[PDB]
Amino acid sequence: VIGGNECDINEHRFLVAFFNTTGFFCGGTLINPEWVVTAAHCDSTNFQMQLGVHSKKVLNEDEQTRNPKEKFICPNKNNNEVLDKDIMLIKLDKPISNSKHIAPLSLPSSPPSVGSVCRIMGWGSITPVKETFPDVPYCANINLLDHAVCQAGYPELLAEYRTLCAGIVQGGKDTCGGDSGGPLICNGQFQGIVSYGAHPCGQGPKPGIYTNVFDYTDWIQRNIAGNTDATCPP
Numbered sequence: 001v002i003g004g005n006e007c008d009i010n011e012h013r014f015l016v017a018f019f020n021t022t023g024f025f026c027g028g029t030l031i032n033p034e035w036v037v038t039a040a041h042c043d044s045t046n047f048q049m050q051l052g053v054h055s056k057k058v059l060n061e062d063e064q065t066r067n068p069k070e071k072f073i074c075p076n077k078n079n080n081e082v083l084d085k086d087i088m089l090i091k092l093d094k095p096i097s098n099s100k101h102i103a104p105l106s107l108p109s110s111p112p113s114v115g116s117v118c119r120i121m122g123w124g125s126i127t128p129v130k131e132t133f134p135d136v137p138y139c140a141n142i143n144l145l146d147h148a149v150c151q152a153g154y155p156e157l158l159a160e161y162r163t164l165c166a167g168i169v170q171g172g173k174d175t176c177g178g179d180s181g182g183p184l185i186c187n188g189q190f191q192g193i194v195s196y197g198a199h200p201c202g203q204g205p206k207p208g209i210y211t212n213v214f215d216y217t218d219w220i221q222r223n224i225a226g227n228t229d230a231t232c233p234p
């Protein structure tokens with residue numbers, strides 16, 4: 001995250017860190033005791049999830065480690081197009097119990113509203129060009145922009161992708177390398193998933209692109225209910 005400050009120790013109890021032998025590579029969102037939502041392009045053959053994490057050097061005493069039991073990707077997804085249905089659902093190997101630094105964040109109950117103030121967070125690079133990864137997650141406030149803005153800034157962005165456009169017109173605040181999979185919180189609701197952006201980070205004409213979570217709530221709930229067959233919105 002660029003242009004932000006260290007997040008508060010108690011404001012991200014639902015933020016999950018994805019890592020493997022090389023370290024942190026993505027974020028995620030705990031939506032209930034056994035399920036985590038992240039970006040599809042964060043999928044790997046071997047990774048683990050750390051919950052209740054703030055500092056990577058001074059450990060919270062209630063940190064928890066979990067492994068992916070089951071992974072769910074849209075059945076109707078083009079595995080070549082990163083912007084196509086960039087969402088993945090993960091069922092934890094064991095349930096999680098609420099603690100000081102751990103608690104789920106429910107799925108959105110209403111669609112996002114343009115102009116709304118949103119908050120981004122992650123352990124991604126805090127520098128726009130060179131990569132500088134922090135030991136603590138950084139947070140920043142941005143705005144939900146008109147979809148036309150991102151459309152004009154990215155030729156690859158097809159209108160069929162169900163995405164959200166967020167940033168600030170003057171630039172300076174944005175997600176960056178390593179924030180992928182993390183949540184976009186608007187009006188206190190889990191409205192998006194960090195999916196795509198440009199480099200360097202923070203350019204006014206190239207805001208961040210986030211997966212529209214609301215559009216997939218049905219598919220998610222059906223997978224959680226046990227269908228695991230349901231298809232995603234086209």
Ligand SMILES: *[C@@H]1O[C@H](CO)[C@@H](O)[C@H](O)[C@H]1NC(C)=O
Nearest residue numbers: 020021022025042043044047
């Ligand atoms: C760790 O997972 C990330 C996510 O795909 C990947 O980019 C990275 O190369 C992986 N490292 C190893 C050791 O597999």
